[PDB]
RNA sequence: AGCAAACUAAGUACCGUGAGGGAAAGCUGAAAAGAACCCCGGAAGGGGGAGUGCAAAGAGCCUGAAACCGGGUGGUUAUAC
RNA sequence: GGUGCAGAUCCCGGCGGUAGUAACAGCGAAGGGGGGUGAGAAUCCCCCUCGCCGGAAGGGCAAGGGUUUCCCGGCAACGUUC
RNA sequence: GCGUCUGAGGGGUAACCCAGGCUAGGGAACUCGGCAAAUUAGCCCCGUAACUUCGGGAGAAGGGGUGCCUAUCGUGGUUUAA
RNA sequence: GGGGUUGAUGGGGUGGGGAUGUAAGCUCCAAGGUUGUAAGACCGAGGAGUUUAGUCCGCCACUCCCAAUCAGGCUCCCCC
């Protein structure tokens, strides 16, 4: 049985940048989604609106280097 | 789920853009079952439709910018102008 | 040009109009009359011997 | 690290919008901001999920939050 | 009018294919040179470059006895592992064939390190003690001997692997009786670096060059660009015509692999042979590779291959000239190598 | 084929600013007895089991060729027209 | 006697190979997160946010079209994909 | 008002093509030909040749200045206003 | 071509080595001006200090903190 953690991780966008250009934000919300489910066998992820803004407030093809993430992994 | 009559019909009566009218997620059950011009201005009273205000240019900049431009001179010497001298004060006028 | 831009000025008002006599759209408005039966300067309908082989 | 306790939860109205702030500790003790704004949300098969707000603390004056979170929230406020 | 001009890279070099294997093995060895027995090639990996300052040894050399300025790369060399004992000789239809592999590990060298690569041997088929004296009683037609060693990657961290690399290696000295001597002696056992190359020497490498992918014409024969109007005009990366006949339409360039491919190098100098990795290391650690922690040789010029690639060391089949000992050294580059 | 026109509207549809030019398309059965009912499917003269009829190429309905495609029978195949 | 077809760049009808291939880029725009309906959602609906036009991609009305307008219900075909 | 100039997703993003940025030393040696690309560029002051149909040439050519801040001065408009 | 817990394969943490050029905030000065009986405080491009700073690193080292888990398919047991 999967432990219902609350663990905080740091996520870190080295491969989705020197990626394409005008996808880097696209992919970036989908490498979340893969980290999440790698770290804690997830089979859904959702992903706060606020987060989603946090990754990228640059527009389409400028995002952060890293972002640091709380997971509440319920059941 | 298409109820683009509520939309049409609020902005005319709130006299908006079409694209200033939001609904309230909470009571969209609401908004649903109106279809006549009356339903729709009791929403609008009721807050179930809200009618977003339209918004201007801040002039704190241009307020400072001006003032500076007046009484120290800052921002009119010969280094901004574009026009020709004619352009800026005509000849005429000034005989005038 | 002669093709596809110069067809773009053929959304006027038509040369040929409905006749009253025949019920086809061959009243020619600028002149006063019908090219397929002659209503506006004929009497008689017009009709040729051409008008079908032999 | 794993978060091991929650120190505070708020709960602040922005433009009409509901925010949650939480203050809690990793393992290492470093103090580390939550910030959630979602309260319901689907399962995977097949119900729904709804936050417990029986916890947050209400807030109405803008200085009735901590210093730390007060000096924090300006930047995440501005896309909310 | 039909000026002249060389063609555009070798003919003897086609096809241009990728190695099918990352450590080839020499077809040709040089001759016995009038020694006692002793391997003829060693095993290294290639770690990075720098550059040191030394005395010419040269006596021909316009630069004798004044300091110049040399590139030079780094090979880290750990002791390799001896196998197994082969013998060649001359067989029914007159080849070359092998005669018998003598393998030696039981005694000592029960490795499972080498069973990542074959899984070898078990403990019932430990018959060796017959193939033994097949290679005494059949003595007297043997023609060639060879050493079957093995690399050991464990001992480099920065060399992340620990399955080895397989390969065999000839003897070259007295007579066929004394070379067998000699090859049981290493069987089983660790052998340095210093037990076949000394400072000084010549050496052919043989490996693998850096892979470069699907290519143009311009970078893998270097053709003519097209020059103005066509720069702009069509299409400039290509050539013009593609053979005159019908007659299987020729051998013209083509797009198509550049790079990894095995070559091979001649006459490439050993200036050092260290123990002492501090005297060698740059400050912040060789970029994209790692630290030094092994022997190391110093090898003055270039090297095929990108880092972290094996690398065979042979004696020098067409020597330039012999050496003798101490090219002395006065400086070596230990800046760091970003920035 | 016979008039361009054997038929849900032929000089009909449709094409041209106009004078003008100008198609395609027949056939269940003796009788609708035109497939009740049950399982599947979002639905479908859709699938399966039934039932009607002398007989279901049963509504895309007389007979139902070849080209073409899919499955199978009998020979045979990666050193060579 | 309107009497025998392999050819007429033959006429008409049906069907191959190319080939599940080209094209669905270029004319200076862009999406993301959460929720809903439904048998079935990149594409329909709601909320937040981000981007583009802003002497036109906004506003008003001709000739021409002819019901395309508005409400309800649909998805066999129709819309360069759904 | 729009994301309907109505197909999308993946890719350390191969060769190559259509548009674009930058290149050490040399500077037309390229080529039918300096084609293409680069250089210059707004406004104020000074200054301006041969020739000429006496109007022009002429923005000839060429030289100098320009941002920000802190204060001022002059001229003019308007307000029941010499 | 490697690693897969009998493990340093990728990330995190901490050090090393690098690219720019010395962060924000606070203290002092600033051509002058606004005040205030004076003392003082207020604006001000910019300068100095805190400060080889702050931000960043498709390089290196150490460290099991996190993840290399679950699952599926194919083919063999010759000789004796």
Redesign the pocket.
Same mark, same amino acid.
């Given at each position: 049985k999967p432990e219902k953690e609350n663990?905080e991780?740091?996520?870190?966008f080295?491969?989705?940048?020197?990626?394409?250009?005008?996808?880097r934000?696209?992919?970036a919300?989908?490498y979340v989604?893969y980290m999440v489910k790698?770290?804690?066998?997830a089979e859904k992820?959702?992903?706060?609106?606020l987060?989603?803004?946090a990754?990228?407030?640059n527009?389409?093809?400028k995002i952060?280097?890293?972002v640091?993430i709380a997971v509440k992994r319920i059941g | +789920?298409?109820?683009?009559?509520q939309?049409?019909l609020a902005?005319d009566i709130a006299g908006?853009?079409?694209?200033?009218?939001?609904?309230? +997620?909470e009571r969209?059950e609401e908004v649903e079952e109106a279809?006549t011009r009356e339903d729709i201005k009791k929403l609008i009273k009721e807050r179930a439709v809200?009618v977003?205000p339209k918004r201007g240019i801040s002039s704190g900049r241009l307020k400072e910018?001006k003032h500076?431009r007046r009484?120290?001179?800052?921002?009119?010497?010969?280094?901004?102008?574009?026009?020709?001298?004619?352009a800026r004060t005509g000849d005429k006028?000034?005989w005038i | 040009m002669k093709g596809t831009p110069s067809?773009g000025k053929?959304?006027? *008002?038509? *040369?040929?109009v409905r006749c009253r006599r025949c019920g086809?759209?061959?009243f020619?408005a600028r002149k006063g009359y019908c090219?397929?039966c002659g209503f506006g300067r004929s009497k008689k309908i017009r009709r040729?011997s051409w008008?079908?082989?032999k | 690290?794993?978060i091991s306790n929650v120190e505070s939860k708020y709960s602040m109205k922005v433009?009409?919008?509901e925010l949650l702030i939480e203050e809690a500790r990793n393992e290492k003790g470093e103090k580390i901001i939550i910030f959630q704004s979602?309260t =319901?949300?689907?399962?995977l098969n097949n119900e729904?999920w709804k936050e417990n707000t029986t916890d947050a603390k209400n807030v109405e004056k803008r200085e009735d939050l901590p210093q730390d979170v007060r000096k924090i929230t300006g930047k995440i406020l =501005?896309?909310? | 009018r039909k000026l002249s001009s060389p063609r555009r890279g070798s003919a003897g070099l086609r096809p241009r294919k990728r190695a099918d294997?990352?450590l080839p093995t020499p077809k040709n060895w040089p001759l016995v040179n009038l020694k006692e027995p002793k391997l003829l090639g060693f095993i290294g990996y290639k770690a990075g470059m720098t550059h040191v300052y030394m005395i010419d040894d040269k006596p021909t050399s316009p630069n004798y006895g004044k300091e110049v300025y040399t590139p030079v790369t780094i090979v880290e060399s750990p002791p390799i592992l001896g196998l197994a004992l082969r013998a060649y000789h001359i067989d029914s239809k007159g080849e070359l064939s092998v005669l018998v592999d003598y393998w030696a590990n039981f005694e000592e060298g029960s490795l499972?390190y080498l069973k990542?690569?074959i899984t070898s041997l078990k403990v019932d088929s430990s018959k060796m003690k017959e193939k033994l004296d097949l290679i005494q009683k059949n003595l007297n037609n043997i023609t060639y001997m060879r050493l079957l060693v093995s690399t050991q990657?464990?001992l480099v961290?920065?060399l992340?692997?620990?399955?080895?690399?397989i390969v065999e290696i000839q003897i070259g000295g007295g007579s066929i009786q004394d070379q067998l001597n000699y090859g049981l002696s290493l069987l089983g056992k660790q052998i340095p670096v210093r037990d076949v190359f000394r400072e000084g020497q010549l050496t052919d490498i043989i490996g693998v060059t850096k892979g470069?992918?699907?290519?143009?014409?311009?970078?893998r024969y270097s053709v003519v660009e097209f020059?103005?109007?066509h720069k702009?005009?069509?299409?400039?990366?290509?050539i013009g015509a593609r053979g005159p006949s019908i007659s299987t339409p020729s051998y013209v360039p083509q797009?198509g692999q550049l790079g990894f491919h095995r070559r091979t190098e001649y006459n490439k100098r050993i200036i050092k042979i260290g123990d002492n990795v501090n005297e060698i290391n740059?400050?912040?650690?060789?970029?994209?590779?790692?630290?030094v922690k092994n022997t190391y040789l110093v090898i003055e010029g270039s090297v095929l291959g990108s880092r972290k690639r094996p690398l065979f060391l042979r004696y020098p089949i067409r020597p330039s000239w012999s050496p003798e000992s101490a090219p002395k050294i006065t400086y070596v580059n230990l800046?760091?190598?970003?920035?």
């Open positions: 663990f991780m740091v996520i870190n080295r491969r989705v940048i020197m990626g394409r250009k005008t996808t934000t696209k992919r919300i989908k989604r790698r770290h804690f066998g992820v959702i992903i706060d609106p987060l989603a803004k990754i990228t407030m527009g389409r093809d952060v280097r890293r640091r | +789920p298409e109820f683009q009559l939309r049409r902005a908006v853009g079409l694209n200033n009218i939001k609904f309230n +997620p969209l279809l809200i977003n910018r500076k009484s120290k001179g800052e921002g009119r010497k010969h280094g901004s102008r574009k026009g020709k001298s004619g006028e000034i | 067809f053929m959304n006027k *008002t038509p *040369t040929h086809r759209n061959s020619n090219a397929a040729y008008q079908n082989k | 690290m794993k433009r009409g919008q979602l =319901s949300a689907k399962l729904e =501005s896309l909310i | 294997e990352i499972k990542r690569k990657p464990w961290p920065s992340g692997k620990k399955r080895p690399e470069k992918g699907f290519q143009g014409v311009i970078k020059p103005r109007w702009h005009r069509k299409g400039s990366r290509k797009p740059p400050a912040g650690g060789i970029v994209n590779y790692g630290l800046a760091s190598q970003q920035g």
